[PDB]
Amino acid sequence: ISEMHPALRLVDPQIQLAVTPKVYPIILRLGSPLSLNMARKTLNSLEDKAFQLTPIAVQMTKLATTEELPDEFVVVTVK
Amino acid sequence: MDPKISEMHPALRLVDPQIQLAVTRMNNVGPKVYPIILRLGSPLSLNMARKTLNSLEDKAFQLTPIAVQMTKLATTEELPDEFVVVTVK
Ligand SMILES: CCCCCCCC
């Protein structure tokens, strides 16, 4: 693992993928950067809408061993 | 700035709700699930992984692809009241 490129990155399990519902820890393979924002509609007119974004800080860790890997997880590969 | 939500650059797609993002937060504590909006600066792929053998000296993992169904939106009426935006690249 500590030699793969893009390296494997384990996302803090505060953020997981809900799949159908089971939730899975996330492993990232980032060939390009990713960003995550929470979005909330703050203005709702049929002619105009506004969305408030809030950046979500995501703690990750580069994996060195497979003993760190969960028993079930999703791998997201970004090109 | 783009003319319509159906032709943004990079493309905007709503991930079909069989796949959502679970964020633990907050009444009580627990996970809330959010629809995922993608801004597709680059392609992505999803694999389901399972550790099928948990022996220290002989571990094995099984990977199964997950088809990510996505939807092009026609108007902003299709944006949910709350969602997460994953921006690639
Ligand atoms: C924090 C990374 C989220 C992964 C998004 C997956 C979109 C199908």
- First-residue to last-residue Cα separation of chain A: 19 Å
How do the strands of the widest beta sheet of chain A line up side by side?
A: 7-1-4-8
Q: How many E-type strands of chain A?
A: 8
Q: What's the main sheet of chain A like?
A: 4 strands, mixed
Helicity of chain A, as a percent range: under 10%
Number of helices of chain A: 0
> Which word captures the global form of chain A?
elongated
Give the cofactors and ligands.
N-octane
Radius of gyration of CA atoms of chain A, rounded to a whole number: 16 Å
- State the assembly state of the protein chains: homodimer
Strand content of chain A: over 45%
Element-level helix/strand string of chain A: EEEEEEEE
**Total discrete domains of chain A:** 1
Helix-and-strand structural type of chain A: mainly beta
GO cellular component, one term (chain A): host cell mitochondrion
Domain 9b (chain A): 4-79
Family (chain A): Belongs to the coronavirus group 2 protein 9b family.
Main location (chain A): host cell
What's the layout of helices and strands?
The structure is a homodimer.
Chain A lengths: L7 E4 L3 E5 L2 E3 L1 E5 L3 E11 L4 E7 L4 E3 L9 E7 L1
N-octane (OCT) sits at the interface of chains A and B.
Structure description:
The first copy, chain A, has 79 residues and is mainly beta. The first copy, chain A, has a four-stranded mixed beta sheet with strand order 7-1-4-8, with no helix packed on it. A two-stranded antiparallel sheet of chain A has the order 2-3. The first copy, chain A, is elongated. The two termini of chain A are 19 Å apart. At the A-B interface, strand 2, strand 5, strand 6 and strand 8 of A face strand 2, strand 3, strand 5, strand 6 and strand 8 of B. Bound molecules: N-octane (OCT). N-octane (OCT) sits at the interface of chains A and B. Chain A: Plays a role in inhibiting the host innate immune response by targeting the mitochondrial-associated innate immune response. Acts by binding to host TOMM70, inhibiting its binding to HSP90AB1 thereby disrupting the interferon activation pathway. Chain A: It is found in: Host cytoplasm; Host mitochondrion.
